[PDB]
Ligand binder design. Structure first.
Ligand SMILES: [Mg+2]
Lengths: 97, 43, 109, 40
């Protein structure tokens, strides 16, 4: 069901699946190609930038050592886990710590 | 065009459709510096 | 004379197996969960809570992941870890049954 | 010996001419993100 075509419900029914927006504090897999080391894909806590004019993936400069990255024009992938099973394992196994 | 031509090379069946994958729910953008973010945080 | 194929040979379905559980005193694997096993336990419990939601955790949390983590930490998780040791040609499947309520959890919180 | 109708087509070009060392064939990187390989 859509959310714009469905506005007659006071609350939700138990068992439903809600596809909510990504918020600050969510974990995300963050990758740069080529992936040579196994630290090339790491899990970071998302900080959502409220500025509508920002279109870049910002990270601390000390975090570039994981990905062998720099800011001369590199592009990096990012996918946010949504499944509970994949979201658990991102926090416990794939965290950049 | 042949059935067995689909297999071998990098753009072949094995290395492009099986060992690799096109996925949804993924994003790409240029990276940037931000000294106010933690090492385990991404803007 | 090696003759034409018969029905005795040519079976595709593998024969069924008998689960042989090693006794507790004769176990060799470690009494400590690996990070892989702990992560799998927490993920499975979180998904099942997302399905059912019935838990005996006394505290209250608003996420299946947190509830699963606290269940693992409080040793109240309804799961077992079966470590497959060997599949014997005669049919037996020797495994190890470990209880995560009496093993050391490697996670941190 | 004065005919040109059935001359070899490939002979009008200049006559004459296993792994490519400079080809990224076993490197699985998207062709749209090749700037990560810049020497910088
Ligand atoms: Mg670069």
């Amino acid at each position: 069901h859509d959310i714009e075509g469905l506005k007659q419900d006071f609350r939700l029914e138990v068992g439903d699946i809600l596809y909510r927006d990504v918020v600050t504090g969510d974990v995300a897999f963050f990758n740069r190609q080529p992936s040579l080391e196994r630290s090339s894909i790491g899990v970071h806590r998302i900080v959502v930038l409220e500025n509508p004019k920002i279109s870049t993936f910002q990270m601390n400069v000390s975090a570039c050592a994981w990905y062998n990255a720099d800011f001369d024009g590199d592009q990096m992938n990012l996918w946010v886990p949504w499944s509970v099973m994949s979201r658990v394992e991102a926090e416990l196994l794939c965290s950049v710590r | 065009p042949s059935i067995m031509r689909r297999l071998p090379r990098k753009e072949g069946r094995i290395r492009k459709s099986l060992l690799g994958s096109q996925v949804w729910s993924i994003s790409r953008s240029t990276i940037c510096g931000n000294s106010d973010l933690h090492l385990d945080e991404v803007g | 004379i090696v003759e034409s194929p018969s029905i005795c040979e040519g079976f595709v379905q593998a024969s069924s197996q008998t689960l042989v559980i090693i006794p507790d005193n004769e176990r060799i694997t470690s009494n400590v969960l690996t990070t892989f096993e702990a992560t799998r336990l927490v993920a499975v419990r979180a998904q099942q809570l997302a399905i059912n939601g019935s838990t005996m955790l006394k505290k209250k949390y608003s996420s299946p992941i947190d509830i699963a983590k606290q269940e693992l930490f409080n040793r109240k998780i309804p799961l077992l870890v079966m470590r497959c040791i060997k599949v014997t040609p005669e049919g037996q499947k020797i495994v190890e049954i470990w209880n995560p309520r009496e093993m050391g959890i490697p996670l941190l919180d | 010996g004065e005919d040109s109708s059935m001359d070899d087509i490939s002979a009008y070009s200049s006559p004459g001419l296993l792994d490519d060392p400079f080809s990224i064939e076993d490197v699985d990187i998207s062709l749209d993100v090749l700037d990560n390989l810049a020497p910088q």
